[PDB]
Amino acid sequence: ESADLRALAKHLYDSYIKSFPLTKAKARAILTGKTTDKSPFVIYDMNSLMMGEDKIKFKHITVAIRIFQGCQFRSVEAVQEITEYAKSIPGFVNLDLNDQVTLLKYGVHEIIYTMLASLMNKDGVLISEGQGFMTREFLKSLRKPFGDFMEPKFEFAVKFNALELDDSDLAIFIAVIILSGDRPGLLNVKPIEDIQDNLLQALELQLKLNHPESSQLFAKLLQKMTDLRQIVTEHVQLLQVIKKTETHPLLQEIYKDL
């Protein structure tokens, strides 16, 4: 039923808004777009960093490393947002808690690199709630171990953004990724898929009404997950090698592995 799918969308979008501070609109204004009225601190040098870090304020402060530990803080911060969001997806709370937890522990990575793309352009990604901007070439130029961490995220986002999806389209697409269903260790895989399908239908009507002129956008968007999985896979890989570099107590704890 058209209306049903339409309201499921308004609801989810409404949730996307209260769960996520930096919406993609609010982030395009600030980014490559003019708007904003007053741009963010740009970090392109080892010196702009010290200045931005010392002036742009910061939470994760106690080079190539301090940056990594930077993502981590924001990620661990993201995950909390995504999770409070998942809890609004109709019927998510009603699933087996063991399942719910497995859906997050597994889909939280893709919902990040998905939303990261909203804060990206070919030359860099917004930082600190958009109050900053770290150039892309600065990042790829970091110490040997850390110069490939964010590069493949750029390569993806450049493609993902190709679809020019807005918030309301991403709110649904995101739901669809959480109510995955093929995550290892799931107990009652049925109600999950039962909801995803109810999410997938809403994505369709949504992507059809919001991008009528975009041919087979639904198909194209679904195949981007084949790209997210590869990022998250290739990512967790590097994330292993970093342990053959870093090798704390109460911190190493707060950052299990996100």
Ligand X SMILES: CCO[C@@H](Cc1ccc(OCCN2c3ccccc3Oc3ccccc32)cc1)C(=O)O
Q: Which of the ranges 49-57, 82-90, 120-128, 199-207 carries the binding residues for a second copy, by CB under 8 A?
A: 199-207
Q: For ligand X, what does the binding mask look like between residues 102 and 131, x meaning CB under 6 A?
A: ----------x---x--------x-xx---
Q: For a second copy, what does the binding mask look like between residues 125 and 164, x meaning CB under 8 A?
A: ----------------------------------x-----
14-39 in b/e burial notation, b at 16+ Cβ within 10 A? ebbeebbebbbebbbebbeeeeeeee
196 appears as a binding residue in the annotation: no
CB-wise, 203 or 232, nearer to ligand X?
232
Residue 227, contacted partner among a second copy, ligand X, none, CB below 5-8 A by kind: a second copy
Where do we find the tokens 């990512």?
235
CB-wise, 143 or 208, nearer to a second copy?
208
Q: Give the type of residue at 45.
A: D
Q: Which residues from 76-115 bind a second copy, rule CB under 8 A?
A: none
Q: Is 142 in the site for ligand X (CB under 6 A)?
A: no
Minimum Å distance from CB 30 to ligand X? 12
Q: Which two tokens stand for residue 161?
A: 């953004």
Closest CA to 114 of 227, 217, 193: 227
Q: Which of the ranges 17-25, 126-134, 167-175, 221-229 carries the binding residues for a second copy, by CB under 8 A?
A: 221-229
Coil, helix or strand for 133?
Answer: strand
Q: Give the type of residue at 14.
A: D
Q: Where are the alpha helices (DSSP H) in the chain?
A: 2-19, 24-30, 46-55, 64-86, 97-116, 136-140, 151-160, 167-178, 189-210, 217-222, 225-241, 250-254
Q: Annotated binding residues for rosiglitazone, as ranges?
A: 72-75, 109, 235, 255
